[PDB]
Design a protein around this ligand. Structure first.
Ligand SMILES: Cc1cc2nc3c(=O)[nH]c(=O)nc-3n(C[C@H](O)[C@H](O)[C@H](O)COP(=O)(O)OP(=O)(O)OC[C@H]3O[C@@H](n4cnc5c(N)ncnc54)[C@H](O)[C@@H]3O)c2cc1C
Ligand SMILES: Cc1cc2nc3c(=O)[nH]c(=O)nc-3n(C[C@H](O)[C@H](O)[C@H](O)COP(=O)(O)OP(=O)(O)OC[C@H]3O[C@@H](n4cnc5c(N)ncnc54)[C@H](O)[C@@H]3O)c2cc1C
Ligand code: NA
Ligand code: NA
Ligand code: NA
Ligand code: NA
Lengths: 386, 386
C-alpha cells in the first residue's frame, strides 16, 4: 500500500512515532500536518532582518536525564554545550536566579554561608507550617518566608496565571525552591544543549526517511475519510486536540495561551543574557528573551548592531489562540476523564491511538514527548502494525 | 639498549615527550623523577580523612582552544564538563566575577544594560589615559576607574605579588578586564573540563606504555653519569631547573612560591562554590579553594558532613621552597639570556634538550606545556632519535 501508518501532527511525539515505524519496522508512514512546517511548537526559524534563530511558539530548551532519549535525539542532530541560566529583575536589580547563595547575598545585603543560609530560611519561613498551607501563597511563604515570596514569586505568578496566588493550589509548589550553594544552572538534568543547526533542521531530519511521506498544510479532519479509504487497516496516531476530535461532545478543555511580542532593536546586545524574568507587577510581560544569546557560537554570523528580543504575555486561550498549557480545573479533569473513555473506545474500534500534548491534554517537554512516543511505539504500535 | 631516550621530570612536558617517543617512534624511554609520584605539580591525591581529590601544589584547571592538544589528552583520560567559575569576596559580599554586568549591578547598586555599562566604564576610567600609565595601578585605573580598582584589584594584587601595585609594571594589564554581559565563565577557551578519574590516573596513564620505564624518587644529578654511561648516544630531555643544571654559574633565577594551608572542616559545604577570592587586605590569603565542588558528580562518594578547604599565601621562593612562578625582574631576564646560551651549547655538545616550566624559566599551563613538548618532539627529537 502507499502507507502502512498515518501520523497526525509533526511535533516531537508524531515525529518520533513516525521515525521509529519507518526505520525499525520498515513501514511506510504518512505524516499529516496542519501547519506549513514540521516540528510543532518546537519549530524555529531565522528572523528575516537579522538572520537570528527565533521561536514563534515559545523558546525551546532541551534537557533530559533520560539517556535513551538523549542517545536517540543525537541520531538526528548534534547539540551545543548550552547551559540555561536565568536572571530575575526586581526593583531595578538583576538578581542571580534561582534562589541560592547569590540571590540571598544580593537581597539580604551580605554574604551568607550555606549553613547560615539554611538558618536564615528556617527563620524566614517560621511563620507558616507547610502542612497547614491552603493555597500557593501560603505554601510559598511556609517554605521561604514573606520577603522572598513577595519579591520574587508573588507578582510573577500573578502574571503567569492571571490569578491571585491566594486562589492557586498549595500543590503548585512541591519542594524548597532554594539552593544552598552558588549553583545557578536553571535545569537539573544530566544532558542539556541546543541543536547545533537549529530546531528546524533537527526536526526535518527526523522525518527525512525513504519510508516517510509528509503532507504539510493539511488538516486531518478534511482529508481523513479519503486517506483511510485508501487503506482501512492502517492505524492512525493522532496528536491533535483530544476534545476537537470528538466534536467537543463533552465540552471544551481549558488551556492557557501566550502572546509573543517580538522586536528588532538597534543594538547588538539588549540585556547580555538569553532570559531576564521581570518579577514586578509594573511590567506586564513575565520575561524577555534575547534570542542571539542562545547561540553565542554563532556570534560572527549575527549582526553587530541589531538584536531580536521577545516579550511574553499570558492569558486564557480563546478560539483562534494556540493552546499551550492545560489549565486543569476540576471541571477540566472531569471532561478529560470522559474524553479518555471515548478515545479508548476509538482505539479499539478504529485503530486510532491518542498521544502527545494536545492528544492527551498534558503539557509535555520535548524529552517527555519523545519518551512517551517511544513507549507507545514499543508497547502498542509494534503489535498493531504486524 | 635498555633505553633510547632519557626524560628528566614527569610533569606534562616530560610525560608528553616520553609518550610520543614511546608510541610514535617505538623508542625505549627512561623517565627519571625526583618525587614519589608522576605528574609534577599537576599530581593530585585523595585527602585521607574525606577521600576528596585535592592538590598540594596548586589547584589545576584544564582548558584549551588548541584542538590538537585537546584530542591528544583525550587519548589518556576522559574529562568532565566542569566549567570554572569564581566569586570575589569584598566587604562582606560575594560578587559575581570577573567584572561584568553582574558585579557592576552588585557594586554600583542597580542594573546597567550592556550599553549603559560601557558608558559607565568610560566615565569611571576617564581620569587616566592608558597611554600615560606608568605602573599597574595607573594602568588599571585608566581602564576601569578608581572605585573598581580599589575594591577588586588593589589589595588582591598586593597580596599576590607582595608588592605595591604602584611598583608593578603597567604591562601587567593588557586588556579591559570587564565583560559587558552576564557571562561569568572564568576561562575563554573552546575546551574545558577536569579528568574524570582525577589527575593522578590521567598522568599515570600517559606513562603507562610497554616502552616506558619509570624511576621515581630519583634525582637526575645523582644518577646521570651512570645512566649516560649505559648508552652515551641516548639524548636527554631535561625539565628540571635551568640554573641548577649549570650549578648556578650565572646566579639564581628568581621565583615566587605559594604556601598552602589545608583544613578539614566539620561541615559538608563551606562556601558553596569551588573558589572564593578574598579581595580585601584584612585577609592574608588570596583565596579559598573548596575541593569537593570541583567534582560535584562525585557527591555521593564525598562525606555528608566534612569538607576540605585550602588557603593560599604568596611569597618569594627561598631555598627549599617549591618554585612556582618566574619573577622576571630585568636581572632575571639578564641571567636567563646567559643560561639560554649555556643550554644551547649543551644541546649541541651533549644532546641534552631543555624544556618545560623549570627548564625554560617560563610559567606554562598544562596545555601550553603539552603543545611545547609536541613541538620539541616534532621539530627536534624525531631527528635526534634517528
Ligand atoms: C510555549 C511552549 C514552550 C515550550 N518550551 C519547551 C522547552 O523549553 N523545552 C522542552 O523540552 N519542551 C518545550 N515545550 C514543549 C514542546 O513543544 C514539545 O515538543 C511538545 O509539547 C511535544 O508534544 P507534541 O509533539 O504532541 O505537540 P506539538 O508540538 O503541539 O505538535 C502537535 C502537532 O500536531 C499538529 N496538528 C494539530 N491538529 C492537527 C490536525 N487537525 N491535522 C494535522 N495536524 C495537526 C499541530 O500543528 C502540531 O504541529 C514548549 C511548548 C510550548 C507550547
Ligand atoms: C601552583 C601552580 C598552579 C597551576 N595551575 C594550573 C592550572 O590551573 N591549569 C593549567 O593548565 N596549569 C597549571 N599549572 C601548570 C602545570 O602544573 C603544568 O603542567 C606545568 O607547569 C607543566 O610544566 P612541566 O611539565 O615542565 O613542569 P612540572 O609540573 O614542574 O614538572 C617538572 C618535574 O620535573 C621534576 N624534576 C625536577 N628536578 C628534577 C631532577 N633533578 N631529577 C628528576 N626530576 C626532577 C619535578 O619533580 C617535576 O615532577 C600550575 C602550576 C603551578 C605551579
Ligand atoms: Na521553554
Ligand atoms: Na514553614
Ligand atoms: Na590553577
Ligand atoms: Na582611561
Amino acid at each position: 500500500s502507499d502507507f502502512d501508518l498515518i501520523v497526525v501532527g509533526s511535533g516531537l511525539f508524531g515525529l518520533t512515532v513516525a521515525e521509529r515505524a519507518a526505520s525499525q519496522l520498515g513501514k511506510k508512514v504518512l505524516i499529516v500536518e496542519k501547519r506549513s512546517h514540521l516540528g510543532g511548537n518546537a519549530y524555529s526559524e531565522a528572523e528575516p532582518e537579522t538572520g537570528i534563530e527565533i521561536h514563534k511558539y515559545g523558546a525551546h530548551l532541551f534537557h533530559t536525564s533520560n539517556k535513551r532519549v538523549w542517545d536517540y535525539v543525537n541520531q538526528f542532530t548534534a547539540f551545543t554545550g548550552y547551559q540555561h541560566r536565568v536572571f530575575a529583575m526586581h526593583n531595578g536589580t538583576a538578581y542571580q536566579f534561582p534562589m541560592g547563595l547569590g540571590l540571598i547575598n544580593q537581597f539580604f545585603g551580605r554574604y551568607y554561608t550555606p549553613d547560615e543560609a539554611r538558618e536564615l530560611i528556617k527563620e524566614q519561613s517560621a511563620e507558616i507550617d507547610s502542612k497547614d498551607a491552603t493555597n500557593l501563597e501560603e505554601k510559598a511563604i511556609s517554605l521561604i518566608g514573606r520577603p522572598l515570596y513577595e519579591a520574587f514569586i508573588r507578582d510573577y505568578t500573578a502574571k503567569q496565571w492571571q490569578t491571585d496566588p491566594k486562589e492557586l493550589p498549595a500543590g503548585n509548589i512541591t519542594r524548597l525552591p532554594v539552593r544552598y550553594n552558588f549553583d545557578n544552572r536553571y535545569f537539573n538534568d544530566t544532558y542539556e544543549g541546543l541543536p547545533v543547526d537549529g530546531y528546524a533542521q533537527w526536526l526535518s531530519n527526523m522525518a527525512d526517511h525513504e519510508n516517510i511521506e509528509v503532507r504539510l498544510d493539511t488538516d486531518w479532519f478534511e482529508v481523513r475519510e479519503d486517506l483511510r479509504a485508501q487503506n482501512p487497516e492502517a492505524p492512525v496516531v493522532y496528536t491533535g486536540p483530544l476534545d476537537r476530535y470528538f466534536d467537543y461532545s463533552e465540552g471544551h478543555l481549558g488551556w492557557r495561551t501566550l502572546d509573543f511580542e517580538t522586536e528588532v532593536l538597534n543594538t547588538g546586545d539588549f540585556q547580555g543574557t538569553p532570559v531576564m524574568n521581570y518579577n514586578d507587577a509594573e511590567f506586564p510581560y513575565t520575561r524577555i528573551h534575547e534570542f542571539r544569546h542562545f547561540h553565542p557560537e554563532r556570534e560572527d554570523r549575527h549582526p553587530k548592531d541589531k538584536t531580536v528580543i521577545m516579550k511574553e504575555y499570558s492569558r486564557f486561550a480563546e478560539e483562534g489562540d494556540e493552546p499551550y498549557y492545560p489549565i486543569n480545573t476540576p471541571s477540566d479533569r472531569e471532561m478529560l476523564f470522559k474524553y479518555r473513555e471515548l478515545a479508548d473506545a476509538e482505539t479499539e474500534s478504529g485503530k486510532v491511538y491518542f498521544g502527545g500534548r494536545l492528544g492527551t491534554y498534558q503539557y509535555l517537554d520535548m524529552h517527555m514527548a519523545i519518551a512517551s512516543a517511544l513507549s507507545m511505539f514499543d508497547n502498542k504500535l509494534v503489535d498493531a502494525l504486524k
